[PDB]
Design an enzyme around this catalytic site. Structure first.
Site, mmCIF file in Angstrom:
data_model
loop_
_atom_site.group_PDB
_atom_site.id
_atom_site.type_symbol
_atom_site.label_atom_id
_atom_site.label_comp_id
_atom_site.label_asym_id
_atom_site.label_seq_id
_atom_site.Cartn_x
_atom_site.Cartn_y
_atom_site.Cartn_z
ATOM 1 N N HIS A 1 0.821 -1.207 0.000
ATOM 2 C CA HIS A 1 0.000 0.000 0.000
ATOM 3 C C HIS A 1 0.858 1.260 0.000
ATOM 4 C CE1 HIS A 1 -3.040 2.930 0.924
ATOM 5 N NE2 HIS A 1 -2.578 3.139 2.140
ATOM 6 N N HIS B 1 0.661 4.801 1.131
ATOM 7 C CA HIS B 1 -0.169 5.428 2.150
ATOM 8 C C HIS B 1 -0.388 6.903 1.888
ATOM 9 C CE1 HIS B 1 -1.536 5.977 6.498
ATOM 10 N NE2 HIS B 1 -1.371 7.216 6.069
ATOM 11 N N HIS C 1 4.086 0.526 2.657
ATOM 12 C CA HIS C 1 4.193 -0.597 3.559
ATOM 13 C C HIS C 1 3.350 -1.783 3.129
ATOM 14 C CE1 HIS C 1 0.196 0.044 5.382
ATOM 15 N NE2 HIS C 1 0.470 1.335 5.365
ATOM 16 N N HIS D 1 0.563 -4.392 3.156
ATOM 17 C CA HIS D 1 -0.825 -4.323 3.612
ATOM 18 C C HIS D 1 -1.458 -5.708 3.641
ATOM 19 C CE1 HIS D 1 -4.340 -2.413 5.050
ATOM 20 N NE2 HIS D 1 -3.954 -1.200 4.713
ATOM 21 N N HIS E 1 -6.470 4.872 19.528
ATOM 22 C CA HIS E 1 -6.352 4.190 18.238
ATOM 23 C C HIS E 1 -6.299 5.242 17.122
ATOM 24 C CE1 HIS E 1 -7.653 0.537 20.329
ATOM 25 N NE2 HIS E 1 -8.610 1.268 20.867
ATOM 26 N N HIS F 1 -7.301 5.510 10.131
ATOM 27 C CA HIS F 1 -6.873 5.881 8.790
ATOM 28 C C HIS F 1 -7.953 5.556 7.725
ATOM 29 C CE1 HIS F 1 -4.574 6.553 5.263
ATOM 30 N NE2 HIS F 1 -4.499 5.278 4.952
ATOM 31 N N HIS G 1 -8.327 5.233 3.657
ATOM 32 C CA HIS G 1 -7.749 5.167 2.311
ATOM 33 C C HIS G 1 -8.537 6.033 1.337
ATOM 34 C CE1 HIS G 1 -5.179 1.411 2.597
ATOM 35 N NE2 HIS G 1 -5.642 1.637 3.808
ATOM 36 N N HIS H 1 -9.639 1.919 8.925
ATOM 37 C CA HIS H 1 -9.193 1.107 10.061
ATOM 38 C C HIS H 1 -8.237 1.796 11.017
ATOM 39 C CE1 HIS H 1 -5.112 0.372 8.462
ATOM 40 N NE2 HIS H 1 -5.724 0.610 7.321
ATOM 41 N N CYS H 2 -8.049 1.162 12.180
ATOM 42 C CA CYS H 2 -7.019 1.553 13.150
ATOM 43 C C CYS H 2 -5.703 1.165 12.528
ATOM 44 C CB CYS H 2 -7.176 0.797 14.478
ATOM 45 S SG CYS H 2 -5.930 1.212 15.720
ATOM 46 N N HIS H 3 -4.733 2.083 12.530
ATOM 47 C CA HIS H 3 -3.403 1.799 11.963
ATOM 48 C C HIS H 3 -2.427 1.100 12.921
ATOM 49 C CE1 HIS H 3 -0.383 1.952 8.855
ATOM 50 N NE2 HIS H 3 -1.185 2.651 8.083
ATOM 51 N N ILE H 4 -2.881 0.726 14.122
ATOM 52 C CA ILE H 4 -2.141 -0.220 14.930
ATOM 53 C C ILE H 4 -2.337 -1.570 14.256
ATOM 54 C CG2 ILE H 4 -1.834 -1.355 17.142
ATOM 55 C CD1 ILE H 4 -3.058 1.290 18.364
ATOM 56 N N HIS I 1 -4.172 -4.526 15.788
ATOM 57 C CA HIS I 1 -5.612 -4.297 15.877
ATOM 58 C C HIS I 1 -6.320 -4.510 14.519
ATOM 59 C CE1 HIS I 1 -4.703 -1.370 19.493
ATOM 60 N NE2 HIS I 1 -4.320 -2.612 19.726
ATOM 61 N N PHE J 1 -10.130 -4.756 13.316
ATOM 62 C CA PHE J 1 -10.587 -3.419 13.667
ATOM 63 C C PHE J 1 -10.599 -2.593 12.380
ATOM 64 C CE2 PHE J 1 -9.975 0.018 17.284
ATOM 65 C CZ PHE J 1 -11.336 0.145 17.454
HETATM 66 O O1 LIG Z 1 -3.038 2.055 5.430
HETATM 67 O O2 LIG Z 1 -2.789 0.835 6.240
HETATM 68 CU CU LIG Z 2 -6.333 0.217 17.534
HETATM 69 CU CU LIG Z 3 -0.692 3.073 5.973
HETATM 70 CU CU LIG Z 4 -3.436 4.149 3.735
HETATM 71 CU CU LIG Z 5 -4.717 0.646 5.373
#
Ligand SMILES: [O-][O-]
Ligand SMILES: [Cu+2]
Ligand SMILES: [Cu+2]
Ligand SMILES: [Cu+2]
Ligand SMILES: [Cu+2]
Ligand SMILES: *[C@@H]1O[C@H](CO)[C@@H](O[C@@H]2O[C@H](CO)[C@@H](O[C@@H]3O[C@H](CO[C@H]4O[C@H](CO)[C@@H](O)[C@H](O[C@H]5O[C@H](CO)[C@@H](O)[C@H](O)[C@@H]5O)[C@@H]4O)[C@@H](O)[C@H](O[C@@H]4O[C@H](CO)[C@@H](O)[C@H](O)[C@@H]4O)[C@@H]3O)[C@H](O)[C@H]2NC(C)=O)[C@H](O)[C@H]1NC(C)=O
Ligand SMILES: *[C@@H]1O[C@H](CO)[C@@H](O[C@@H]2O[C@H](CO)[C@@H](O[C@@H]3O[C@H](CO)[C@@H](O)[C@H](O[C@H]4O[C@H](CO)[C@@H](O)[C@H](O)[C@@H]4O)[C@@H]3O)[C@H](O)[C@H]2NC(C)=O)[C@H](O)[C@H]1NC(C)=O
Length: 497
Positions: free
Chosen positions: A64, A66, A109, A111, A395, A398, A400, A450-453, A456, A461
């Site tokens: 991905h 980002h 990164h 995905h 949290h 993010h 997209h 989603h949460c970017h942790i 999670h 999540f």
């Molecule tokens: O954007 O994971």
């Molecule tokens: Cu989270």
């Molecule tokens: Cu990302």
């Molecule tokens: Cu992204």
């Molecule tokens: Cu993502």
């Protein structure tokens, strides 16, 4: 820097960024992955060549980019089982997109699952040859990128499911652990009298970081991909996947100064030079700094950030005042996270392919409850009320395919319908916050939310915002190799994943 056209060759390798050898996923031989660069208007042709051999860190992959909109190239967005099937080891896949209308500081990164943690994560910068902020600084090049990365001694699948923090924090790929307090620190060189645009990129998998530089202040000029009015600060709390550009005026005495990036959990503080790097003025001895921490007097608050050029808030100045309000109710059963009663489970057929095959309504899209269908040219508002029920807070959520207006920040009860900062990752705060965002649906396709942790996310999540499902097929013209991915992937043996 490589790009805008380039080969990203993936292999497995032993690395020791913090003094301790472990196996990692690397990119053209290195983790963090190398800086990819280009300029506004470029066409990026990034040919991902999968030569990964290690099943434990996944031999399959997906990448991905980002913060890019991927307008009409939703197929290239990277997200596994939403936007494509994974690339198989022994194969290649060309990601081919344009960035006509965007500039700033991004990253890339893996995905797929928690693979990015095992090392597939790096910076990505798109320079603006008429950057409106250019007069504020002298120097902006490959050496002014600063990355932050939480580093684990156990691999992501081998370790805890929700790990207890990192062992090290890496600044430009280097740093120390408690066990390796004589490992090499990164050095960032400056010349007395010059001003640097430093582009700070969180490649974090989980913890946020409180970043400072002894003896110096930082004049923020960009948040994520969005240019801000200049804001002078002396401490920055940067959440996973966020970015900031800031100007540093290198007009202190010629010396070594500590660069600090302290995580909220894991190995905390600075004992033995952990969570530290070196800012070194040319001419200083090549030696550790002896500077001490000052209490911050002008820390960053997201409420203090506003866009540089006016960026109008979609909808009308009042709560729920848009074509489509949504509220996201978090929960957690000890194993998986849940949004409005459902934990995202990746489907066998990618969501995009589902849509191309004729599935355009929420009830016909699988997984049933995780996919929300949005009408086009419509204003949207989403609220992420923090809750004692979703541990691991705050949290950072993010979206997209979009940057969005943050009309209400964490630690604020105020609603700003007038001049809020826009960005692409936002902390949803702690119980008591109701962090709220807005955006226009001008980008047909399915986009992850989603949460970017990453632990999670891999635990469900997430939801998918399938906007403009009727025009999704025609607007996202797909290439044959994208079509070829799922048959190749579905043919794989479980051990070759
Ligand atoms: O954007 O994971
Ligand atoms: Cu989270
Ligand atoms: Cu990302
Ligand atoms: Cu992204
Ligand atoms: Cu993502
Ligand atoms: C493909 O990629 C994967 C993922 O990167 C690679 O995995 C590596 O796999 C090896 C084993 O195949 C593994 O080494 C083993 O690690 C385990 C786990 O270690 C932790 O266990 C405890 C955590 O709570 C903790 O006590 C321990 O701490 C101490 O470990 C040593 C002590 O000498 C020190 O290095 C360390 O600083 C610390 O003091 C670890 O945190 C470990 O248990 C294994 O040792 C085993 O011990 C048991 C105990 O009874 C014995 O029964 C076994 O015989 C064995 O000796 C061993 O060290 C790596 O950890 C994995 N790497 C990562 C990053 O996870 C895989 O190699 C790769 N494949 C190829 C082909 O390259
Ligand atoms: C975080 O913020 C979100 C978004 O603001 C918030 O969700 C919204 O909460 C409001 C009220 O808390 C909901 O509004 C309701 O709308 C319907 C009308 O169709 C009614 O249930 C209510 O209307 C009135 O009802 C009475 C009139 O008979 C009045 O006495 C009463 O005062 C109401 O005015 C009510 O307004 C709105 O539907 C949600 N939006 C959603 C769920 O999408 C959320 O509650 C916040 N979370 C936290 C934890 O703070």
């Amino acid at each position: 820097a490589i790009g805008p056209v380039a080969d990203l060759t993936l292999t497995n390798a032993a690395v020791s960024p913090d003094g301790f050898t472990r196996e990692a996923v690397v990119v053209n031989g290195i983790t963090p992955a190398p800086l990819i660069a280009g300029k506004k208007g470029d066409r990026f042709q990034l040919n991902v060549i999968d030569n990964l051999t290690n099943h434990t860190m996944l031999k399959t992959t997906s990448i991905h980019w980002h913060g890019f909109f991927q307008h009409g190239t939703n197929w290239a967005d990277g997200v596994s089982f939403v936007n494509q099937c994974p690339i198989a080891s022994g194969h290649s896949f060309l990601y081919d997109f344009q960035v006509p209308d965007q500039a700033g500081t991004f990253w890339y990164h893996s995905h797929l699952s928690t693979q990015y943690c095992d090392g597939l994560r790096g910076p990505f910068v798109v320079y603006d040859p008429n950057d409106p902020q250019a007069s504020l600084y002298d120097i902006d090049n490959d050496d002014t990128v600063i990355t932050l990365a939480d580093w684990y001694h156990l691999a992501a699948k081998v370790g805890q499911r929700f790990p207890l923090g990192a062992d090290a924090t890496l600044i430009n790929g280097l740093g120390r652990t408690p066990g390796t307090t004589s490992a090499d620190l990164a050095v960032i060189k400056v010349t007395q009298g010059k001003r640097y645009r430093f582009r700070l990129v969180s490649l974090s998998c989980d913890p946020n970081h409180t970043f400072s530089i002894d003896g110096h202040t930082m004049t923020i000029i960009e948040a994520d991909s969005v240019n801000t009015q200049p804001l002078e600060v002396d401490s920055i709390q940067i959440f996973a996947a966020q970015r900031y550009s800031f100007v540093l005026d290198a007009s202190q005495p010629v010396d070594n100064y500590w660069i600090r990036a302290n995580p909220p959990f894991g190995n905390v503080g600075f004992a033995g030079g952990i969570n530290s790097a070196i800012l070194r003025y040319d001419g200083a001895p090549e030696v550790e700094p002896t500077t001490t921490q000052t209490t911050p007097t002008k820390p960053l608050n997201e409420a203090d950030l506003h866009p540089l050029t006016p960026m109008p808030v979609p909808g009308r100045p009042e709560p729920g005042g848009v074509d489509k309000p949504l509220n996201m109710v978090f929960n957690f059963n000890g194993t998986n996270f849940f949004i409005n009663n459902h934990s995202f489970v990746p489907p066998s057929v990618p969501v995009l392919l589902q849509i191309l095959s004729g599935a355009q309504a929420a009830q016909d899209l699988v997984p049933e409850g995780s996919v929300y269908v949005l009408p086009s040219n419509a204003s949207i508002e989403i609220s992420f009320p923090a809750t004692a029920n979703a541990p691991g807070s705050p949290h950072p959520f993010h979206l997209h395919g979009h940057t969005f207006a943050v009309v209400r920040s964490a630690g604020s009860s105020e609603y700003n319908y007038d001049n809020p900062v826009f960005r692409d990752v936002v902390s949803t705060g702690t119980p008591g916050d109701n962090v709220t965002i807005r955006f226009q649906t001008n980008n047909p396709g399915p986009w992850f939310l989603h949460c970017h942790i990453d632990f999670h996310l891999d635990a469900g999540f997430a939801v998918v915002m399938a906007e403009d499902t009727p025009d999704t097929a025609s607007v996202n013209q797909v290439p044959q190799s994208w079509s070829d991915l799922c048959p190749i992937y579905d043919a794989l043996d479980p051990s070759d994943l």
